[PDB]
Amino acid sequence: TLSILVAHDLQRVIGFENQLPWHLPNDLKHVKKLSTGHTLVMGRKTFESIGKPLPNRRNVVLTSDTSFNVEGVDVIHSIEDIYQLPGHVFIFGGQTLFEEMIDKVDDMYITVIEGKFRGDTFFPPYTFEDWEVASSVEGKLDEKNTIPHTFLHLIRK
């Protein structure tokens, strides 16, 4: 299975200055729950933003840099390499990866951040004409999680 995993706001903002624009611990818990024991494929900028591979899953980085050889990270140099990866593969970002993969993935796990942030990177437009809502679950708000959010699982029709 090839899936997208993304958090985007009401206007599809995903990033600002190589970070996520919002602080939302519950979204990280969601990422942990979904991708632990599986595979993340991410662009080089996303990797450098996190600085180290996420524990307890295979971290795969897509880059043209042939000098890229980082401990605990597997490197790939082509989109085509993604299709050779075993098991459940999550396309993890950033903008460039999402743009390249949205027409290719089986499904998408989207955290809709129900606010409007300043962004410099975006998830590409998509329409519910193409995507069945397998589930939609409102995130719980508390002291540590103060921005409304909804977890969507969309499956290509």
Ligand X SMILES: COc1ccc(-c2cc3nc(N)nc(N)c3cc2C)cc1OC
Per the annotation, where are the binding residues for NADP(+)? 6-7, 14-19, 43-46, 62-65, 92-97, 100, 121
Looking at the Cβ atoms of 66 and 143, the one nearer to ligand X is: 143
| 43 forms part of the interface with ligand X (CB under 6 A) | no
Q: Are strands 131-138 and 121-122 parallel, antiparallel or unpaired?
A: unpaired
**Three-state secondary structure call for residue 9:** strand
- State how far the Cα of 156 lies from the Cα of 154, in Å rounded to an integer: 7
Q: Is 54 in the site for ligand X (CB under 6 A)?
A: yes
Round to whole Å and give the CA distance between 100 and 96.
6
31 binds, among ligand X, ligand NAP, none (CB under 5 to 8 A by kind): ligand X
- What gap in Å lies between CA 13 and CA 93, rounded to an integer? 12
Residues that bind ligand NAP (CB under 6 A): 6-7, 14-15, 18-20, 42-46, 49, 62-65, 77-79, 92-97, 100, 121
